[PDB]
């Protein structure tokens, strides 16, 4: 990579000396070394880039967002200098975007990537990076347009193929997404061996009835993406006891389970009252997990945060639950009423994390037509009784009764998680 313009080649000796200090771990001394080069040579792009890299390393040594914010600006200063070589310009702004994403400045990272695409219009990899930027902010429409441009000039780019197929599947274009996901994974290009693409390829195949779906769950498991063929969560803590169905004693949460079963009728009655007098609080399921039917949820807690307006509708239930931080503090779970009507079939799916267990309390259960499968075992609900399963295992639900079915869903931390882990895991 050509990093020295005409002037920097003349001071290459001073530049290499400072870089050796940064490479020797003496970051604080290399910071002042490159700062002195920037003072003496204010137009040197290599001296400016060296100052940015040292600020980057110092931000890690101290885990400082404020220091990294300065490095982000210094990387941009490199681009504003005259006669900057193309390799140095690309490297500074790409790293700036990467650090903007690390800080959560996703809007800023997008502008940096847009500037790179304008500067190097032929580099398709920068377009692929711009596509990821749109995906990180949820703009699947602009991401789709980007990967369509990449596939027009580079039709066999595997990175662009899997990301196009992911967007297609997200838009419920199930049958269309499969060739892009399969051929993209099979390309072996960097960035295509990702669990997210094995997950959605196998799920797309399941929804169209293709038997090849479980062959891809096998390969995903063999490559280290899934704990097993059945358990396909992607945000995991390794080593947690993996088991489809649990008993209350196994979870250790006996006091919560007894409290739910002893007081189940009051939980039912507050849910029925919301159905009758405030049905707008029940929101339709919005993750494209239904094949058909009507399925809605009324959420009291999410990501360990109490929903204040929701607890005004179920005040006694919220008061009862606030005694159990193992569920109210579960930042990777929810507490919610869940209603399902006849004619509903929920696609096989898994949750995102192995760090929770999911409890179901039966509230209004018709005598026939309702069942839930987890892994290879199908069960039914009982009014006033708790079922416990690990929803990181593939599960599927049917509702073919003659009236509605109402349950209460209570997520808890996996019992084997230490208190330190429950406080540090990013919320989902």
């Amino acid at each position: 990579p050509k990093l020295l313009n005409k002037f920097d080649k003349t001071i290459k000796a001073e530049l290499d000396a400072a870089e050796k200090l940064r490479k020797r771990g003496k970051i604080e001394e290399a910071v002042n070394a490159f700062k002195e080069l920037v003072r003496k040579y204010p137009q040197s792009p290599r001296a400016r880039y060296g100052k940015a890299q040292c600020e980057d390393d110092l931000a890690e040594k101290r885990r400082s967002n404020e220091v990294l914010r300065g490095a982000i600006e210094t990387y941009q200063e490199v681009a504003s200098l005259p006669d900057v070589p193309a390799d140095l310009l690309k490297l500074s702004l790409k790293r700036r975007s990467d650090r903007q994403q690390f800080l959560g400045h996703m809007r800023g990272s997008l502008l940096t990537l847009q500037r790179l695409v304008q500067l190097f219009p032929n580099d398709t990899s920068l377009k692929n990076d711009l596509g990821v930027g749109y995906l990180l902010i949820g703009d699947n429409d602009n991401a789709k347009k980007v990967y369509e441009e990449v596939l027009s000039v580079t039709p066999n780019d595997g990175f662009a193929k899997v990301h196009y197929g992911f967007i297609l599947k997200a838009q419920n274009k199930i049958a269309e997404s499969i060739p892009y996901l399969k051929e993209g994974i099979e390309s072996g290009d960097p960035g295509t061996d990702d669990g997210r693409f094995y997950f959605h390829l196998g799920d797309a195949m399941q929804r169209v009835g293709n038997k090849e779906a479980y062959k891809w769950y096998e390969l995903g498991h063999k490559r280290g993406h899934f704990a097993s063929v059945w358990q396909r969560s992607l945000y995991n803590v390794n080593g947690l006891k993996a088991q489809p169905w649990w008993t209350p004693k196994e979870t250790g949460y006996t006091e919560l389970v007894k409290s739910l079963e002893r007081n189940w009728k009051l939980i039912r009655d507050e849910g029925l009252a919301v159905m009758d007098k405030a049905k707008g609080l029940f929101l339709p399921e919005d993750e494209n997990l239904r094949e058909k039917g009507d399925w809605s949820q009324f959420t009291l807690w999410q990501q360990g945060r109490r929903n204040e307006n929701a607890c005004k509708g179920a005040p006694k239930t919220c008061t009862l639950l606030e005694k159990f931080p193992e569920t109210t503090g579960c930042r990777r779970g929810q507490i919610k009423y869940s209603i399902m009507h006849p004619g509903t079939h929920v696609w096989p799916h898994t949750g995102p994390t192995n760090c929770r267990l999911r409890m179901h309390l039966g509230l209004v259960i018709p005598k026939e037509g309702c069942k839930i499968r987890c892994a290879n075992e199908t069960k039914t609900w009982e009014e006033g009784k708790v079922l416990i399963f690990d929803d990181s295992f593939e599960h599927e639900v049917w509702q073919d009764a003659s009236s509605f079915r109402l349950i209460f869903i209570v997520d808890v931390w996996h019992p084997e998680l230490t208190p330190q882990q429950r406080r540090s895991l990013p919320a989902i």
Binding site: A59, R63, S64, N65, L68, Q101, F102, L103, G104, M106, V132, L135, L136, G138, F166, A170, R196, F199, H200, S233, L234, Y235, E285, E287, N288, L289, Q302, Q303, Q334, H349, T350, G351, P352, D391, P426, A427, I428
Partner: peptide, 18 residues
């Protein structure tokens, strides 16, 4: 969007620096 019951989003967590 949030990953409440499945893995529908490209990423399910948020970045907040260090």
């Amino acid at each position: 969007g949030k990953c409440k019951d499945g893995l529908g989003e490209y990423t399910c967590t948020s970045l907040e620096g260090f």
